[PDB]
Amino acid sequence: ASGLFTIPDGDFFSTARAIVASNAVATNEDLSKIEAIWKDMKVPTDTMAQAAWDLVRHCADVGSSAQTEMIDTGPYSNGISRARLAAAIKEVCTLRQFCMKYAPVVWNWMLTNNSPPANWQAQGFKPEHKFAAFDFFNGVTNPAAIMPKEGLIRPPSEAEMNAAQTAAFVKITKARAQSNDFASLDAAVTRGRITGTTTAEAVVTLPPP
Amino acid sequence: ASGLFTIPDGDFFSTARAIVASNAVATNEDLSKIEAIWKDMKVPTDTMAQAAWDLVRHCADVGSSAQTEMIDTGPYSNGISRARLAAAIKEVCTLRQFCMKYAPVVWNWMLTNNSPPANWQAQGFKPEHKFAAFDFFNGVTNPAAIMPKEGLIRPPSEAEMNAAQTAAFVKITKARAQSNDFASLDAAVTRGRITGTTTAEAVVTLPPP
Amino acid sequence: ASGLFTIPDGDFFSTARAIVASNAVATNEDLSKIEAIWKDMKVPTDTMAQAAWDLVRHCADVGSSAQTEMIDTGPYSNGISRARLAAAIKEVCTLRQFCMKYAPVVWNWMLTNNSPPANWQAQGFKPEHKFAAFDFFNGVTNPAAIMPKEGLIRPPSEAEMNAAQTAAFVKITKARAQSNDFASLDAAVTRGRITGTTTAEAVVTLPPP
Amino acid sequence: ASGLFTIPDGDFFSTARAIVASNAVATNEDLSKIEAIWKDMKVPTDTMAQAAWDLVRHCADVGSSAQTEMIDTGPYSNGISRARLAAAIKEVCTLRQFCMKYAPVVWNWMLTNNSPPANWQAQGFKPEHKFAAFDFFNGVTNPAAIMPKEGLIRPPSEAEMNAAQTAAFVKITKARAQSNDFASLDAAVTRGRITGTTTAEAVVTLPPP
RNA sequence: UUUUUUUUUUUUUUUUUUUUUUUUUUUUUUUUUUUUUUUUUUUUUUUUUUUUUUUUUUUUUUUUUUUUU
Predict the structure, then answer these.
(1) Are B104 and B131 in contact, with CB atoms under 8 Å apart?
(2) H/E stretch holding C149
(3) Interface contact B189-D166, CB threshold 8 A
(4) According to the 3-state scheme, what is the secondary structure of B61-89?
(5) In chain C, N or C terminus with fewer CB closer than 10 Å?
(6) Integer distance in angstroms from CA A143 to C1' E9?
(7) Can you tell me which residues the record assigns to a coiled coil (chains A, B, C, D) (predicted)?
(8) Which nucleotide does the CA of A62 lie closest to, via C1'?
(9) Hey, is B151 helix, strand or coil?
(10) Is B112 helix (H, G, I), strand (E, B) or coil?
């Protein structure tokens, strides 16, 4: 048995370590392209990582959607605003994929300072689940993401994971209900409609048990 | 591991404090532009904050919609009416974003005086939930908003947060049902219709469990 | 990359401010020519702007067509009638282009006094949309127009914009149906006809959804 | 397998980069001919690009039709008016093709300053879609156009693309309804008619879903 | 009786905005109209399913009063 029919024997399992890569997280080729754009717009390379952690922490208070307006300037750039840092990222990967890379860093930072995501109440989270009230919360246990050196202070509880999956259903289905099913945006197909659906037909509910 | 691949070590989590910024709350650049317009229409800078807190407290009795008619004059301007203060705000940010900034102030003010939002019964709130009967109630636990020095008297209960989310569904869906799906307001698309929908097709219900 | 192939870098977007100019609004060269004619027919230069705002406010009660008869004299001229002020304007630009320049001023003036355009019922407007019942209502959000210092009291609602676009369809199509398609007004082409069309063939309808 | 039957192997896909060219965007031969005319009418070559970006930004407030009257003079020429710059462009390519080349620049400029196209309300756009209210908005994601160095602040949303396609239908069909089907402009064919169509037969509607 | 295989499990989409006011009266509730006739036959095949056509251009301005009931 050779070629693709080779049977592994036990030397492979004890020695080989798979480097984990994920397509929901910004790749190593993605992150090298961010650095080349960021250093060309004069982000200091001595605080390049802290400018990323500050941007993703701000992206836990607001969304990580491509339409999200970043607000202010962090203290680790040379006055480069967070909107300009995020616009450089969206040329390479999505903002959500970049934020998934730093999700354990932001999770530890929020749990150290006891500072939840800012709009947890507007998102409909209960106060006992408010630390899961950011998108890209799925990346906190993804091994392709940046894990801090001493690990997570606290893993996410099962109730926090439950609340995040429910909120992910509500936010994504509401965003799809504001979109359409039109396969083309030409007026021959859309007939000048945004959703192609009335207000009552677009109401999202999670059906009861 | 350097650049964007730097692993945080624990010095960062104990020292760095993220200044919280939110795009649902009026920004610091927004508020500086309000002050320049307000002092030019001769609002006293010694009571500039109290004129804002009086306007947002009045915006808890009426809406914070852009179409809302402000009624009277507060005691902290130099006779500048609340409609003129709100019209200056709507040149910079939304009125709702300005009111979200002062939501914990208005929440403490209403709980101190035992004075709920004025039209809580018309909004369909039960009497035990009537203190949540304002829009921009989501901002009372947003850390980007102005928190008073000694804190909230009482946090919002879970039942108050439940009632506010339900009322937010009813008021927003009713406002969308009076709007249309028309992608253009030209008569070639609207065909001279406001909603493009009959009265029976526009009825909003929250489907039962 | 130089010449017309130069890539903008971010210094341009933060520093350069485009002065907005519109060809639907009376230009700065247009308005300087109005002043030279108005001061030569002895309009007081101390109330030159108020004579314009009074004329455009009167042009919200009647049309801004070139055929419109202006009625009376405002209080800010030296007894110069509004028909003589409008005849001087029509030598330079259209009356509608002049009125578009002052559309936010007239919009604020009408909303302050609760005084809608005078013939809103004859125009077929519903009472809840009657403040949009003037032509040149499109200019109220045009940034080339004169914006008052503290801003609009209320922006136009979506239903008001819908009603204005529908009324613009009806009034313009009815005016075209009283015109012709004749490419020349010589009797060899027109054959002594005004519209070249019967009464039944000239009926305007907005086709139903 | 050689000649036109050669099978690509994977070296071609990893190495070759196609330079994108579009016939809806002004070509590199087009732009070199603009520069030769612009420098001969003494446009400064140190601000040749900024004079183009100022002209296209003004062409987002007014149209990019060949019949469009440009209004004023930008600050980056040596007093050369925008009408003279546009007349030089129309000798080489269309004004719309030139403006498509700088559509991401104008898109970033408008989103930085929060300054929409000036006549968005007259075009029938809803306020939530008003940043798409220019023609040549199709060029903002065309890779043949000039992309700024740090990228777009925000990509166009799906609802903005929907509104632009609907407005493109309405404006182009209305312009065709004012034209004719006559195959020749000689009076033997046109019979002295502009459209060859009555007013009621020329009404444009987008048929309802 | 037949129907129980395979395929389909990735990404993307989670921001903002929208929550005011107005609209809640009156009128409209009778009578008439309910039968008969019409239900069959015929018509179910063949042929027609390829290519071609998808670019560009066209999106500004002007026209919205009065009169006519």
Answers:
(1) no
(2) none
(3) yes
(4) HCCCCCCCCCCCCCCCCCCCCHHHHHHHH
(5) N
(6) 21
(7) none
(8) E15
(9) coil
(10) helix
